[PDB]
Amino acid sequence: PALTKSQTDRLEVLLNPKDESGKPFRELESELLSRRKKDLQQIYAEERENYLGKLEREITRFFVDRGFLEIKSPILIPLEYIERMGIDELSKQIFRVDKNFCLRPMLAPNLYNYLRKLDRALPDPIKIFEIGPCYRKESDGKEHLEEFTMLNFCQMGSGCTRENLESIITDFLNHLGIDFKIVGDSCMVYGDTLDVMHGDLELSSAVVGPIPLDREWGIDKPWIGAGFGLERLLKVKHDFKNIKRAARSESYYNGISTNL
Amino acid sequence: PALTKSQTDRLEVLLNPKDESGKPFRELESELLSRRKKDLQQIYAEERENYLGKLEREITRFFVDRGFLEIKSPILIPLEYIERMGIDELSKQIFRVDKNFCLRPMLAPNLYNYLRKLDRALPDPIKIFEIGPCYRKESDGKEHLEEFTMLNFCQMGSGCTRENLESIITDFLNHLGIDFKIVGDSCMVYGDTLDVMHGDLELSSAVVGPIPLDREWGIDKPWIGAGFGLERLLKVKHDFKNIKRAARSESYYNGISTNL
Numbered sequence: 001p002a003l004t005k006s007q008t009d010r011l012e013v014l015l016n017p018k019d020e021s022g023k024p025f026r027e028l029e030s031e032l033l034s035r036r037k038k039d040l041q042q043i044y045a046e047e048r049e050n051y052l053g054k055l056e057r058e059i060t061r062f063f064v065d066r067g068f069l070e071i072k073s074p075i076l077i078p079l080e081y082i083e084r085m086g087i088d089e090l091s092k093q094i095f096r097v098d099k100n101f102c103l104r105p106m107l108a109p110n111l112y113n114y115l116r117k118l119d120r121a122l123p124d125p126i127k128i129f130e131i132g133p134c135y136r137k138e139s140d141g142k143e144h145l146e147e148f149t150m151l152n153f154c155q156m157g158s159g160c161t162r163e164n165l166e167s168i169i170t171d172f173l174n175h176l177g178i179d180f181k182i183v184g185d186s187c188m189v190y191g192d193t194l195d196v197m198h199g200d201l202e203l204s205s206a207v208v209g210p211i212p213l214d215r216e217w218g219i220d221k222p223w224i225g226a227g228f229g230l231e232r233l234l235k236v237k238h239d240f241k242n243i244k245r246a247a248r249s250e251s252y253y254n255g256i257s258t259n260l
Numbered sequence: 261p262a263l264t265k266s267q268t269d270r271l272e273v274l275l276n277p278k279d280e281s282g283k284p285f286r287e288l289e290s291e292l293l294s295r296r297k298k299d300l301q302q303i304y305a306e307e308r309e310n311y312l313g314k315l316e317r318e319i320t321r322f323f324v325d326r327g328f329l330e331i332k333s334p335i336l337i338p339l340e341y342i343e344r345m346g347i348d349e350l351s352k353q354i355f356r357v358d359k360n361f362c363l364r365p366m367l368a369p370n371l372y373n374y375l376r377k378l379d380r381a382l383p384d385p386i387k388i389f390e391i392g393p394c395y396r397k398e399s400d401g402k403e404h405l406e407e408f409t410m411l412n413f414c415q416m417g418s419g420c421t422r423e424n425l426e427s428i429i430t431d432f433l434n435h436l437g438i439d440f441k442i443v444g445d446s447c448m449v450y451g452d453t454l455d456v457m458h459g460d461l462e463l464s465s466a467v468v469g470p471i472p473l474d475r476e477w478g479i480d481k482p483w484i485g486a487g488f489g490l491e492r493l494l495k496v497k498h499d500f501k502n503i504k505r506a507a508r509s510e511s512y513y514n515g516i517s518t519n520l
């Protein structure tokens with residue numbers, strides 16, 4: 001008669017946010033299976049784009065159009081970058097590779113290096129961004145992924161104000177159609193941050209520099225910047241209950257169960 | 261009087277393929293520094309796109325337009341996938357992470373899984389592709405990167421012929437403006453391959469299935485497929501002498517030295 005907790009977990013795997021007893025499990029499951037197959041058939045017939053890849057392209061266009069240079073830097077980075085980031089906590093979260101390398105947990109160290117290098121070539125202000133994989137060993141699963149995709153944009157030189165930072169953040173999220181509020185906060189690496197929140201979900205940490213860490217990276221100018229999780233953004237935008245629906249995954253494609 | 265080998269290495273870092281004694285080092289270096297700064301100033305003023313990101317978007321459009329579903333699957337994969345790929349050589353090249361995981365050296369295992377899963381939902385033939393980071397510990401540096409980007413497209417069910425495989429390969433490279441020849445070859449994992457060559461550079465390995473490995477992955481249909489290195493393609497297309505100019509890098513941006 002009543003659904004078991006296991007049967008309910010199974011149907012919840014198959015349930016999309018848009019979907020609207022005493023029908024048996026097998027018929028509810030069969031109905032959901034049929035709707036999800038059709039969802040995939042529709043993607044496949046019409047658009048064929050992955051949400052994560054698509055979101056990356058749309059964000060890329062946004063920042064290129066606003067004068068930010070698109071970076072593609074290494075994902076596998078020297079372990080020394082972590083120490084030079086002032087990380088020794090987040091330190092338990094580092095995936096190490098070989099004796100000397102690790103999977104980057106953030107984009108900041110490589111973007112510090114690009115900021116310094118490009119200051120020799122490019123006019124003030126220097127505007128750059130990267131979108132790409134980042135990795136953190138994580139105990140949670142509801143808002144945390146071990147493998148995720150971060151956007152980090154930043155500017156250095158003139159115009160590096162808190163007002164300009166907030167304005168970019170605001171134009172960005174309004175462009176994406178994502179509701180937010182900007183709250184003051186802090187963390188170990190940076191300060192002193194602004195946190196961009198969706199209800200109780202952190203979409204972004206943002207910082208108005210300078211900060212004392214800059215000197216370690218050969219940086220001696222004002223800067224502003226923010227990092228956003230693309231899977232968090234997708235999660236809010238598609239109203240996914242679990243962030244795993246927005247991840248690189250063999251179990252979900254565009255938030256649709258692939259176990260059909 | 262004559263340039264030292266070190267000075268010549270330095271100028272070669274600064275030399276682009278398009279650039280056309282007895283001028284001293286310092287003046288040749290100063291001239292090249294000036295041209296490279298201007299190259300970066302021009303990217304930054306006009307397009308602002310990274311070559312690797314841009315090539316990915318263009319390839320994505322190509323395959324989406326031809327009816328292939330865009331996949332984004334994990335980069336960090338179970339070590340068991342390597343063994344189930346029949347790899348135990350390429351095995352010394354695997355970057356391991358934790359006891360149970362590794363950085364994927366190829367896209368094939370996750371695409372095998374997607375082929376099987378999607379066969380329950382999608383009409384025949386099933387056409388899919390992924391573009392993304394792959395990792396192999398490598399002794400060479402001239403045509404090999406430890407961190408690279410592979411494209412793998414594939415089809416399963418009807419139309420999985422050698423002729424159709426070659427036609428897609430041909431339309432693809434002609435679209436990209438890349439000269440090639442298709443040669444028969446073989447490797448340990450697959451067969452029996454077709455190798456897509458640019459002079460002596462391998463652009464792609466391609467396979468007409470079925471093969472006995474399929475059964476390990478729950479696959480019992482004809483398939484065709486190919487994997488291309490995006491950095492190899494960029495290398496040919498931009499006439500870069502070294503493939504490091506085409507990599508995710510803090511030393512090169514669009515093949516331009518960032519050490520200016």
Ligand SMILES: C[C@@H]1CCN[C@@H]1C(=O)NCCCC[C@H](N)C(=O)OP(=O)(O)OC[C@H]1O[C@@H](n2cnc3c(N)ncnc32)[C@H](O)[C@@H]1O
Binds near residue numbers: 105
């Ligand atoms: C780049 C310049 C030069 C130096 N630094 C500058 C800069 O711009 N700094 C300003 C702040 C940038 C971001 C900072 N480095 C950072 O890593 O912030 P976090 O808050 O730790 O990560 C940013 C976002 O990534 C997402 N994220 C985090 N961990 C996860 C997870 N495990 N699963 C899924 N999503 C997650 C989440 O949305 C989070 O708000």
Ligand SMILES: C[C@@H]1CCN[C@@H]1C(=O)NCCCC[C@H](N)C(=O)OP(=O)(O)OC[C@H]1O[C@@H](n2cnc3c(N)ncnc32)[C@H](O)[C@@H]1O
Binds near residue numbers: 404
């Ligand atoms: C996906 C379906 C389901 C199962 N398999 C199917 C399939 O489509 N198989 C057909 C063949 C696909 C490719 C095969 N798995 C593979 O890994 O081929 P490789 O030749 O080892 O790699 C393909 C290309 O990646 C590039 N590449 C390689 N190593 C490097 C390097 N270290 N640095 C830079 N570039 C490199 C290089 O261009 C090479 O030609």
